[PDB]
Symmetry: C3
Subunit: 101 residues, 3 copies
């Protein structure tokens, strides 16, 4: 009643290891969680290793501080407030480079 | 492999189940879920799909996208930096009340 | 009842994994790490998702897609990109290669 180690016929496992306080779900194909209110995770580090794609299908994604990306595609429009510093290439608008490199 | 089974049917109508033939884990019929951890939470899977009819909030010092980020619209509140070539088309890029391609 | 109709596990490290049907709340607490490894996909369908990560959220993926609006405090684009439609900048200076493009 105080332990968790489930081993399914397809090789999937759900286990909790109290020595390292580690919860593991492995060997599954899909997971789906459907809730009517909220899903919350509170932890210093979140790591999502997704070899195809992460889709956030929502009216609004909010990042409360910094957002860092390799490349950016804004599809429809946007607003920017504050100081914005572009360097290391050329910023073009409507086919016109705004400050040649 | 093992022979364990998971199919919990709770009195509020929620279900937690694993189906090994299709290797599908399902959690249904709940109101809330939370995970609170002192170290890390990791998900390793090709596709992550979040369908959130109100909002997704990432309340963190830093969200890092290692490659491409695509959005419908963007709002930057407190500034930033852009490196590389940035190609703007299909509308007006305005700064401080002037359209920049016609300045 | 006597069947599989409940979930409440308290582990010797103080962690809890439980489902509380009175409030329909699934809770994992008191752990150090969690991981989920799947070969196909993970889906979460719920009105509100909240991730409170006091160090970082890393999305290590070819593509992150936000289907509608994305709001951020600050933005850092490292390699380049594209923008379509109207992009309205105010409340500071937009500089390119060391030149302020329009002073208010």
């Amino acid at each position: 009643s105080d332990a968790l180690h489930i081993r399914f016929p397809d090789g999937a496992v759900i286990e909790y290891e109290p020595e390292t306080s580690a919860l593991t779900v492995s060997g599954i194909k899909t997971a789906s969680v459907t809730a009517s209110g909220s899903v919350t995770a509170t932890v210093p580090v979140v790591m999502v290793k997704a070899s195809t794609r992460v889709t956030l299908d929502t009216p609004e994604v909010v990042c409360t501080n910094r957002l860092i990306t390799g490349t950016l595609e804004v599809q429809k429009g946007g607003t920017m407030r504050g100081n914005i510093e572009h360097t290391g290439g050329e910023l073009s608008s409507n086919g016109k480079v705004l400050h040649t490199l």
